[PDB]
Structures are given as structure tokens and as C-alpha cells.
Amino acid sequence: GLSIGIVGATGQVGQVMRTLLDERDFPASAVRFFASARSQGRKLAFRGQEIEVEDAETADPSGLDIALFSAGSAMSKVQAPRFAAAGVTVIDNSSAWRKDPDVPLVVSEVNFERDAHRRPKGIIANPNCTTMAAMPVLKVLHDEARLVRLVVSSYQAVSGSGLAGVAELAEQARAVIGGAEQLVYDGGALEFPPPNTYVAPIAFNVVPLAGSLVDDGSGETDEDQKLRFESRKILGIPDLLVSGTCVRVPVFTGHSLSINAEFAQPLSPERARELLDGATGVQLVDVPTPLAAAGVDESLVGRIRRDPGVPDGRGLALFVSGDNLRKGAALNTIQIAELLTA
């Protein structure tokens, strides 16, 4: 019955959107693909036929029920309203609409019922991938005990930066692997291909800098701040206290978060495990890892401990890993599309 479009169909997220529409048997009677000029004209196979890659800027959106955007914020600022004007419900995987009070910022199993129905601009915004990984986990704990403060340190995979991050990690690793053991005694022993995407080499390194420094005197990047703004909007906690540090690691796909979460009443590790074991979009594991998360749908959560720095057992430390291309981007937009058409 449904007509679906994918805007930005050739990028990594677009590819995963395509794979998931197919794998999840999304009941779309028509599927359309869009990219930008010079990518358009080409056809891409989808379930037994070849689909034209149309021009997102100039193609006619009429007829589409839902469009999944993963084409950057610039494209979204212009095209999402154009599509919505043509009657299309837009689900946007970009930062363009996230701060707009008339655009719900939705994690499918968290705040769909609460926020998704109120969309006067015809747009639903897809959350930041790093934040998204934590949301199915934190929602469950919040409902139980009321979340009041987060400390977060992330371990972010390079596919977060698109193909460019993947290529930068791969080319560096390939160039230096031959002399790798020398890095044990001298981090400058080898010749790394010059970094381009990242501020330092990423292979065999960690880089505590993701994004642009916000012009607010804070020293925080926009990615650091997304953890604050988006957790607040998604969980419906306008005054949530959040301190996040986004750190890039040499992992291809799978973002991880070391989370110290404080609640308004005591919440034990045993009780947190009991609640998360049940939970939608969550899998309880002893040691979450991004390799285990990459290619699967659920947020992996474990290493749940009391944080003694919070009085009276109101604080936990826990670790989460999640696929940043799947739940972190493509999958969530599709789950929203599923709930919209249930």
C-alpha cells in the first residue's frame, strides 16, 4: 500500500536503509531513490528490480507517503519542507530539524507515542547515533527511577564519519601494520598517511575530538553537546544534567558508551539487569563490544555496577554498544516508518 522514498540512497546510511527495507519486508508498493546530480540517472537494484536514482532537488515528491532522508542537514533544510509540502511525511537522519520545537526528535521505542503525532511541519527528526545507542537503555531505567544526571565517555567507530572515516582508518592501518610493534616504544616511529577527516591518526590511536567546537566558550564540540540536548528532548527531561566526551576509536562500525547515570531514587545493578533483560531494543550481555553490535539491531548493555560517588545507591555505571548505522541511523527511521503505518 505504502509509497516510500530514500533521499541520500547511495551513502552508507542509505545502503543500510535499503538493506533493512528489504530484510524487514517493509510493505511499500512503490520505492523511490534520490541522490544529487551526477549520482542520478544510475539505477540501483532493490528486491527483484532496478530503481532509478532520481534528483532530490528537482524530482517531484508527490505520491510518496514517507521519505527517509540521510543526505546531510543542508539538503534537509531545503528539501524536507518541499517534500512535506507535497504531502510527504519526512523522517530526517540529520541535525537540521533536531532543535526545532515543532519537530519531534524520536527514538522509536522511547517517545513515538508521546511526541511523533505532533508534527506540524510534516517532519520527524532522527536522533544523533551516539545518543540513540543509549536511549532504549536509559528510557527503561528512567521510567523506573527517574534519571537526573549523566556522565558519558564514548568510543566512536569511524563509519560515523561516512565512507571517508572508513577509508581513513583502513588506509592508515594498511600503511603502518608492517611496523606496528614499533609503536610500543615510540608513537612517532612510523609514517602514517596524513589524516584528513580526523585531527590525528586514527589507526592504533584514540582521538578525543569529534565535531566542531561550539562558539559558546564551553570547549565542547557539537557532538559533545548533542548528548545533552538530544537526551533532554528524547527522554522529556528539559533540565537533565549531562556531561559527555566524544572520543573516536579505531573501530569500523559500533559506537560504545561508558555511562555513569544518577537517578532520583535508589536503583541497584540487580534491578537494572532485571529491567533491561526484558526490554525492547536491548540485549543484556556481560561485556558489550562494537564487533558484537555491528550488524545487529539491539543496544548491548552490561558491566552494570553501583557508582559509590552517588549517595544511597542512586548511581550506576554501565556500558553500552550499538551499531551506529543500524539503530543509530537507518533502523530507527524504518521503525518510525513502521509505527506510522501500523
Next chain:
Amino acid sequence: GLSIGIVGATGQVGQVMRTLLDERDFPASAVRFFASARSQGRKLAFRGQEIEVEDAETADPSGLDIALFSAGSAMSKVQAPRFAAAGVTVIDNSSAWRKDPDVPLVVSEVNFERDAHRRPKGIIANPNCTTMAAMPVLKVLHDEARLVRLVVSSYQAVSGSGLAGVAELAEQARAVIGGAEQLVYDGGALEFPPPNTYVAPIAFNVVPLAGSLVDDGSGETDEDQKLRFESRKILGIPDLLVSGTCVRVPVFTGHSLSINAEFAQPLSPERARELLDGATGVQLVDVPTPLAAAGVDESLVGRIRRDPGVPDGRGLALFVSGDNLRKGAALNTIQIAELLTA
């Protein structure tokens, strides 16, 4: 004038001890090396001559002024008292003596003057490498504002596990690098050499598990707990609140820490930078990385921000990287030896 010994001279830390004794022109008129049977007999070059590798268990310690141990805790429990009995001041890089109230646990520029002189057992304990990286930084901030709570998430290099960790990371990376991009869509796409040292693959992964689970019902590992016990003893803050999560990353050498530190009075990022820029054993940088830290002596510190989850500007978030074989192990023992013989 001085007579120095190195017990465990053939391991990674022993190698760095040897390199540094040479590079730092340590005024030892005699240098002796020790390992265990089957490593002994061999000679190792040191500054213009070849030194016999003696048997740590059966050799006679008499004559040595100082012995630097990096031979594990089991060996230390027995041999450190034997050496101390023979009049040797023992500086031990192991966990054996760290919890002993009659053994100072010393970071050279932090608590040497305060604690080192009181050593009734003839032993000074070298701190955990992960904790050690943070100590020259936190001491300076503590002196200014009084440190009261830490949250810590680490990014720990594999040389922390000796040659075995280095080899496990190298062999895995070499085996899978050919098909690496497949990990973007499926973390289980490739055949990793089976892990042995770590609970999961380490190449292109992160593994939130370092050490043995403590039999105290906490869910914490012994490495997680070292951040609590050792920070308390080193900084002289018996009731310091600490929550740490130790996470292994695919880095050869260089441990990193994302630290959220709370003080008893307001401490601004600007003021923290002013204090650390001066500081002994510290280098202020925009983006600390373990590749930059590996092969150098100072703790690299930056990304200093206010943590808004702490009222009234009493909380910071900051990031530290430090070489775990140098300051984290070998260098600190040598700096203590230097201060003992100044």
C-alpha cells in the same frame, strides 16, 4: 656511586627501565640484571658492556643500593623482603605491596616527600599505570581546589598486558586487515585468530573488561578498583569517591582517561589550564592522544570543560593520555630512585 639492580629485566617494563637508566644517565657505578631460571645465564648489553642476567630467586642481593622490580606480584611477595633484608631499597612495579600500610605507594612528583621516607619494610610500591597517568594532573588540581569525586572511563593500550597483549593485537589486525571494510556492516564477517589474553577480539574492537572480577559482589574488576584504592592512597584522600571503568582499545602503548572530576570549591577550565601548563610531568595540549604520549615522559592533558552536572562550577571534564610503560611503570620507578639518591 650507586649500585642498581633490575629484577624482571627481560620484560617490556624491564627493557624500558634499561633504556631510561641509560638515557637519563643514572649515576649507577654497578648495574645488575635478574630474571627467572632459563632466562638467566644470558647477557644483555648495557652502555658499553654486557651484563649477566642473574637468577632473582637465588642470587645474592648484597651490595645493591636499589632494586627496581618488574617481575609480577608473586615474585615480589617473596623476593622484595629477601632483597630488603640484604639492605636493598626495593621499588616494586607490581600490585604485591600496594595495599600494605607500611609500604608507601608513590608517584614521584606527587607524594615522594610526604610518604617515601617512611618505609619500614624497605619497599616502595609503584602505582597502577592507569592511575599513574592521572596523578601528576590531579595532584595539581587537588592542591588548588580539593578533589572530592572522580568518574573515570579509560582507553587502555595492549602493552599494559605485556608482550602477550601486543602480539594478540598485532596477529588479529594482520589476519583481518584484508577484509576490514566488511566490519562496517557485519562485525562477525571475518575470521579472527581466537582471543587468548582478552575476553573478545581486540583489533578493530573495544573491550570493556580489564582484569579479574573482584569477589565482593560489586561487578567491578581489580583494575576498576585500583583507580579507587590507589588514587586515595597516592593523593592522601582516604574517602575519595571514585567510579572507574577500564576499557581495552586497539592501541599499542599509551593509556587514556576521560575524567570527570569534582572539587570542594569552584575550579574553572581556564584556571585548570593555567595550573597544568606550569606543572611537573604534565603537558597541556588541545587533543591528547596515546600515539603522541607513547615514547614521551609527560602526561598529556586537554579538552578541559566545565561539567554542568556539578553545581557552581565545582566540576570539570578533562582528558589525559600517558605512556603506560614509561611514566606508567619504568620511568616513575627511576624518578623515585633519583629522588632517593639526590
